[PDB]
Amino acid sequence: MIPDVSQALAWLEKHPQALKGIQRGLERETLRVNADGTLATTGHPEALGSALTHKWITTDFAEALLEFITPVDGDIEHMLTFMRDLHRYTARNMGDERMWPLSMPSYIAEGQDIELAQYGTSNTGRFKTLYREGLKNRYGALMQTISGVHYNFSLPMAFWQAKSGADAKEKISAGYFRVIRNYYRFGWVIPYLFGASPAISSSFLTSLPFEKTESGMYYLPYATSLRLSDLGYTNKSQSNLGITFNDLYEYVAGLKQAIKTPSEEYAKIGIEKDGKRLQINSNVLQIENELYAPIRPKRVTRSGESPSDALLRGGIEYIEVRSLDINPFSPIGVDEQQVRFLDLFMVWCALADAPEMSSSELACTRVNWNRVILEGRKPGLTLGIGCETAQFPLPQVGKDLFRDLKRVAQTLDSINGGEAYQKVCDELVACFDNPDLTFSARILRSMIDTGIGGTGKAFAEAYRNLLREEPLEILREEDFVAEREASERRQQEMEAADTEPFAVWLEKHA
Amino acid sequence: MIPDVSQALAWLEKHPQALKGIQRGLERETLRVNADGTLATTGHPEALGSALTHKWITTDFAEALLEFITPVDGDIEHMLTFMRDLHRYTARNMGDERMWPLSMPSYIAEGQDIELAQYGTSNTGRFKTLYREGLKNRYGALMQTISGVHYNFSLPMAFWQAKISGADAKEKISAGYFRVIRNYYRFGWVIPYLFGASPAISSSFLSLPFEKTMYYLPYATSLRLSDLGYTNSNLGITFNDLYEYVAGLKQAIKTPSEEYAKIGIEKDGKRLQINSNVLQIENELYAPIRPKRVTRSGESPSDALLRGGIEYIEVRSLDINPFSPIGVDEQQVRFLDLFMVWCALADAPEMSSSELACTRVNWNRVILEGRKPGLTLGIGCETAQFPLPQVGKDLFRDLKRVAQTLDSINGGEAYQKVCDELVACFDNPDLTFSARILRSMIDTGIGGTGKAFAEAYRNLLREEPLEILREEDFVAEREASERRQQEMEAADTEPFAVWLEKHA
Amino acid sequence: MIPDVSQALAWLEKHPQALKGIQRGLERETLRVNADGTLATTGHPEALGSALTHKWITTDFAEALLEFITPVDGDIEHMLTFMRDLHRYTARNMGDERMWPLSMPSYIAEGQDIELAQYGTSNTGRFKTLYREGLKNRYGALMQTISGVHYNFSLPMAFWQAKEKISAGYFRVIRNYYRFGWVIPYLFGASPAISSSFLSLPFEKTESGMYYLPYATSLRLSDLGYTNSNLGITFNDLYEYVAGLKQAIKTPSEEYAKIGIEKDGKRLQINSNVLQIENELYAPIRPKRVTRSGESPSDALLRGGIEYIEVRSLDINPFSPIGVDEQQVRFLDLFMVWCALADAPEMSSSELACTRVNWNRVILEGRKPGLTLGIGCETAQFPLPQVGKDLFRDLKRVAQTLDSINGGEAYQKVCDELVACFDNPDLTFSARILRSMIDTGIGGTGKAFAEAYRNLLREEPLEILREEDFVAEREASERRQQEMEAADTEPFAVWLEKH
Amino acid sequence: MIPDVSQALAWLEKHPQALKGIQRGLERETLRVNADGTLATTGHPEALGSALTHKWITTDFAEALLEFITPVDGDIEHMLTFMRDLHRYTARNMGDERMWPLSMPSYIAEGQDIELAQYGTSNTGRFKTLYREGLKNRYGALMQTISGVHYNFSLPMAFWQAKSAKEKISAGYFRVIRNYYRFGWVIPYLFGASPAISSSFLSLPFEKTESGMYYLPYATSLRLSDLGYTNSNLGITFNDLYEYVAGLKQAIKTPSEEYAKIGIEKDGKRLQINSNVLQIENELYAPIRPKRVTRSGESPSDALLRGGIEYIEVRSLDINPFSPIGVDEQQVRFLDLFMVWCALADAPEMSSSELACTRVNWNRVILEGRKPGLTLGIGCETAQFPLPQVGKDLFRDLKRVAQTLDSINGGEAYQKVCDELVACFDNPDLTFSARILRSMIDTGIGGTGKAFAEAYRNLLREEPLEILREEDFVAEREASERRQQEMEAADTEPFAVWLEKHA
Ligand SMILES: Nc1ncnc2c1ncn2[C@@H]1O[C@H](COP(=O)(O)OP(=O)(O)O)[C@@H](O)[C@H]1O
Ligand SMILES: [Mg+2]
Ligand SMILES: [Mg+2]
Ligand SMILES: [Mg+2]
Ligand SMILES: [Mg+2]
Ligand SMILES: [Mg+2]
């Protein structure tokens, strides 16, 4: 089932310097909670300054939902250390609150009570909140509290150079679409290794054969990542809207068409209700982020550009992988082993040939993802090519892919010096013979002993105590203070610069 | 530019009995006004009973907007007399109020608080009012006070037999009516030419090279059909095939409109409209002509077409005839019979929705400047080169043959007379309704002209005795109509907002 | 989710004559009701002769359940006209009674006294009635008065020439029909509502007292309808299938042994096995061969292989006086040919069971915006609209091949019309009949249609069959029954064993 | 509204090879600016030699307005690469200056003293500079700094040979021009990239940002508006070669009350060439222009009379802000499709006021082309056709021309382009102008210009040459300076007297 990539591997083995200079960035989300596991209802902590403008620390959907963002970086340890400093500083400046360490929250009784991220009174800040109001009304606040890690990745120019004019940005875009098509066909290996959400609170809910406990914890005995299942998110699958990844313009046209298509469903919600604005507009997507997407091509926008404008202007700059659950075994929710595996997998995805796929061939790649998501750890599980009958045992497919990943590891290890990528392959490949080594088996044992609540409360306490004692390593305290002051100032400035009232301004971005 | 219809007229001539028993019905709308021409703000005249259920008299958009409807019927004189009985009775039972005799209203500024039509508390009743709230909020109440005449028409089975057992019937009849419709779009501009009666509008309604005083265009026929009138394109709806038509129409009631969502579904707890889709219901699709089948109880217009095929055709493009106390007359009706039949005979290739947009070019010429000397028309979008009068005459040689045939089965010369009268309008546009009514409006204004005719027509009608309906028949119907409303208002279990949910 | 068929299609496109000579037949059932909508209690109308032996008109489960059957035939218009002559004649010869136009009845209470179909006094007659007694006692009479339409279909010899190979090819058809045939109730299901008499699921009730699911298509096919599996019948091999079938005839049932076989001399079933006879295996589609004298269906199959297939999924089309129309028949032609072209991997017993999951989704909520289908038991993934369009890309190609041997564009017109239903489930039979039932009720709607179709059908002249053909067939059928009745037949118990 | 072109398309699908060997050339203009966006006041960069005689690089109106010209070519990739080589070389040889990347400039004041292109002391040079002095005095220098791309196009002989000469070809290109007037507004719809205008250029419902930028919310190309690069009072028509040329030659002799008030001389300095409606024929500004390469100091109109229309010059392209060279393959292929379509569709002859009527749709698209529910009309008649439906009707035909070209070229590039561009008719937000407007509302014309100019300079300075070697630029620098020298030495009469001989 794994295709044959000997030509591309051989090519890579003869050009190791083509991989020198990979760039990465991490985003990690986590709810602020009290010791009892419930969402804090305090505001974004003072010491973090303005969530709207801050460089490293912001909020996602909810006021209690923190997001840490590392600046693009070529060194894995440097980037993880940076991430850990954000966590350390935050952990000691949020009063008695702490950070929820799983993707799935514990029982929440009233989704409707959750405060949306608040961004002040400037037009940009309100738009951002109104966007969330919109999401709240379309899909419910509850699902937005489920969190994850994004891993952002780009190959160096050297890679493309070893593989002229206006073609360059086109070859690069084509190669990233290749990576994306391959992620669709094979990326189920990610939730298999690192899925960490085999259980969900009944407060968040089916034909599924759930085991139940009296506190409302539901779980599937072999699942890997319910975060990625239909129960773990509410919005429209890019796959489902019929967006494809064969060609850049086509992709952008599909995306932009969704921004402009009105929706009968969302019009029923209404745009206003008692002088309170309820969504930005009533289109399928309010803005491009509303598209649910396990993986997404990107380019950093310039001032005023929409994300898709940037793509059209400059082609794909880098890939965002969104399918990683929070790593509950790391205080920062992600570790070196995961980052190195994604390096190897993404690189492999860029090498393997990937035929174009129509909407329904893409839909078929999801059959395997669903098997792995809901019962990836089942003894005897078999996978198939697209929709064809399942017939390849999962472990053997894993070992096949790792035969290749190991060759890429050898190449990366020889340029970085050391053995770090090879060790990672050996550690991970073992998970195909023993599914009990995977994150989701480990975290299910924990959740059976103490619940989602008990497991999250206990890690959150333990992690709070590491994080708040550890010395800052790269950022120092005065950097947090400086960035607090500067972020607050940029917010005062946007507030003062507005000249039109929100209603008028809105009528030109709605 | 008129197609060759020889083969079919010859067929018709050998089959005169095939046209025996054409069925017709008319609807005619008119605003209740005061002596001074302002809109009456009183309610639907007590004597008429329940607008909601009455068999012959109701309202349209506005509480003050009367509409008279005749039951389907095979006899022209009978139908016209019935319509007149309705007017007679009504004029005698509305105090000092009288009926505006023009299409275009006059004493109404933009956003005048025009009372929507009222139908009691029933769910069906409250839904109809809400539809109108929607229409008001989407288009303005003002445009909804422009009034017209609809002519409803069906060929007799004998016609289709003379050209089919079981399931075939339904298909052939439908196919013939879509032909009628396509031909109407190609050639129906002849209607506003002859009978358009709104070459002027009051300022309230207002690009075009107007003249002021009251706005008008010197050669205009029917502004009620222009963009400033009873009009409301981008829909892709075609007339080739029953299934395609219904699919397109059903698609439109399910299509959300951004513009309309921005009105809201309800503001401050007052429900502003049934929904925010392009059409709230299928009635909102304004069109010059429309295929129809009588709906079962609560069944939708498009369901009925899909179940039974096209039953009859509704021609919607007639302005009020200002020269008749009942707003329509025998000359118009007979011309429509002739033109509809011709539409059923002539070959009419299928049209894509952009070919249909091209047929509107001639309509637009005729609408805004149909009486211009030298005016020429084209085939669709192709360059104009056919002088209008020669096209009319050409059409009328065919209508003449159809008229001979109809006259030979009835007995008499009545249809031939109509051909001879109307064909003269092509040589002299000054004989057409719009030339004549424009002279009158340039001189006394839309206002003056309307009040005068209103007043004359009222006096005439007040004295005329009833002929088919007896006073007793209106009284029984008042009672039975009010009875049916109560019998509905009571039979409602669940409250409006929930019933709406299931039907919105 | 649709398999790739483009190779088989290309072959078909190079061999259009391989489809010339498709044969079809229809069966359509309907309750005889009074104008008030209650079930008639009179006997089979006498102008129709012997239900037991008549060639075209008979009864199904109940004495008031008419069934109309067309003789196998190559021409669509002709088959539908014949069906219509049967309706016309009957409508003008059943007194003030009329034909219920919907699959689901109302005005019939649970455990009401439904007279079983009566076939006179011969071995065969008594046997047919006894089998019904058996069904009544096993599953209840009520379920048996749900009516439907069966479409019977066979490919010409020409097709295969481009006999054990004929059977394997019809099994391919069945396998594909299980995996994908939910498209039929989606387009044509017409029983979204159900009388209370038939009562888990999120039903709505009307003040009127009517139950319904907002997005349902065909409750007739649901578990509350004409239904039921751990029998393990498979459709991979002719003999494999026939064996499974015959074992099912011989397998005793704990539950039915409980009913008794005799209680006070009245025999209560044919036997106490899971299936009394082969007909009892209810299924959406069924392999078939016309049976000889005293032969059983399986014997028939064993002798000559599958001759044709019977598609049993169609609800009564509420919008046609004869309960089925040309658009349906044309669609099934396309669908059944496609089923014969697509590769269908063999399927085990429980793989076949998994195909029900999609059926149930479409049945219970097929019109739900955003509905997704899966493959077998697996997680729903594929949006219903895209799946349908994919199938119609292929059917459109089949349609071109059929139009070009027949002349015209009739098959392609059907593709265009119906694909439109995937963009708007409000065009489907079930959205339409539901709107109407929500205003007036099952009863209301049924009575209104039944009355209009009565008046309509009584005024239409006969076209293929003359009144005198019905009289002859009445008399011949009456005579055929008398001759069987007067035969010196074997003792019943022995006779039974001999079946 | 779109004519039916079935017979011509059926004809084409039968004679595919009728289109093999289309010829194209591009002109692209750009201002030389500093990192701060202000107009560079240095001279024509030295590495480029003589703007007057150089073969590929020259100036337009202003000394700071660069212009790149590709030599006529049959290969699209080759042509684009060649244009790019010119840019690369220039970008490396202009100090810290860069190329302004938008049609509309931002940091240029009204009445700003812009240095006119300088061509030296030869009579020809001084004439060219004087022409500009004329334009400056007649319309202001500001307008002349708005820049554009020209797409030059000819069908191969194989095309005319199959369609049934010299007079047939001219009638064909006139049919192209009449079609272009009727339907060419499709160009600024797709590729207009100037929906905002700086206040320097200032009855229309303009919006204005706190920063001081004016714009129309649905506009496409204000470069084509009255406020842009425009001068039509002349009633020149496109029915017949001799009528066209007569109209044009007459225009050059017709005096103008307005220009006479300016004067021919003032305090010893000559102000214009004459005080006629057009000083010379180039002054006639239009969206499209019929052309022949002029041989032997012949005038453009002379060339046309001598040899008929050789090619078409489509002048209505704005600078593509999303391409370092101001134009991309997608635009070129679309213009191939649309010009070929314009040669195939029937085009009745048009009076000068029928021509004026075609301008009504143009203005609509120019000023509010992206407005939801905009409708177009035929000529001056009631607006009745929703633009999306019209555009899609057109693309049904372009798509068949596209199949033809792809079958003779191999591949699917032309069909891909139809699929891309047809999407703009369902979604105006894909068009160049919506994309550039979002960026301008936010950082203004200045901010957006500077930012793009900065990135393209970095990009181009790094790219190696691909078709021209550095030797070639050096070789042409020397050869162009020589020719100028020669022309300067070879002059006999002082310019004042030479000028009377070419009044
Ligand atoms: N088969 C038919 N042929 C001709 N006219 C008909 C037929 N059926 C109904 N009509 C007429 O059509 C008209 C319908 O009027 P109305 O109830 O006002 O409907 P709407 O307002 O929807 O057009 C009535 O005048 C009726 O007489
Ligand atoms: Mg283990
Ligand atoms: Mg009305
Ligand atoms: Mg039966
Ligand atoms: Mg059967
Ligand atoms: Mg030029």
PDB file of C-alpha atoms in Angstrom, chain C residues 1 60 118 127 170 188 194 210 228 265 291 308 318 335 354 378 395 403 409 421 435 465 476 487-488:
ATOM      1  CA  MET C   1     -17.554   5.390  -3.044  1.00  0.00           C
ATOM      2  CA  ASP C  60     -51.548 -10.503  -2.636  1.00  0.00           C
ATOM      3  CA  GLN C 118     -59.317 -16.525  -0.502  1.00  0.00           C
ATOM      4  CA  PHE C 127     -51.983 -23.869   0.453  1.00  0.00           C
ATOM      5  CA  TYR C 170     -27.033 -11.640 -12.167  1.00  0.00           C
ATOM      6  CA  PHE C 188     -38.789   7.470  -5.194  1.00  0.00           C
ATOM      7  CA  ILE C 194     -46.945   6.345   9.150  1.00  0.00           C
ATOM      8  CA  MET C 210     -50.025  11.261  12.222  1.00  0.00           C
ATOM      9  CA  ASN C 228     -37.523  -9.092   8.265  1.00  0.00           C
ATOM     10  CA  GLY C 265     -57.443 -28.703  13.646  1.00  0.00           C
ATOM     11  CA  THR C 291     -41.363 -22.020 -12.462  1.00  0.00           C
ATOM     12  CA  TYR C 308     -34.383 -12.447 -14.381  1.00  0.00           C
ATOM     13  CA  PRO C 318     -48.608   8.558  -5.214  1.00  0.00           C
ATOM     14  CA  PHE C 335     -29.435   1.384 -12.828  1.00  0.00           C
ATOM     15  CA  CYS C 354     -23.508  -4.063   6.625  1.00  0.00           C
ATOM     16  CA  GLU C 378     -17.797   1.990   8.352  1.00  0.00           C
ATOM     17  CA  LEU C 395     -25.748   6.263 -15.856  1.00  0.00           C
ATOM     18  CA  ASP C 403     -30.956   6.131 -26.563  1.00  0.00           C
ATOM     19  CA  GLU C 409     -33.123  11.197 -25.963  1.00  0.00           C
ATOM     20  CA  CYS C 421     -32.907  15.595  -7.078  1.00  0.00           C
ATOM     21  CA  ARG C 435     -45.837  18.460   2.187  1.00  0.00           C
ATOM     22  CA  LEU C 465     -57.253  -5.072 -23.866  1.00  0.00           C
ATOM     23  CA  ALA C 476     -61.132 -18.870 -18.302  1.00  0.00           C
ATOM     24  CA  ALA C 487     -59.334 -32.787  -9.690  1.00  0.00           C
ATOM     25  CA  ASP C 488     -58.832 -35.955  -7.682  1.00  0.00           C
TER      26      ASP C 488
END
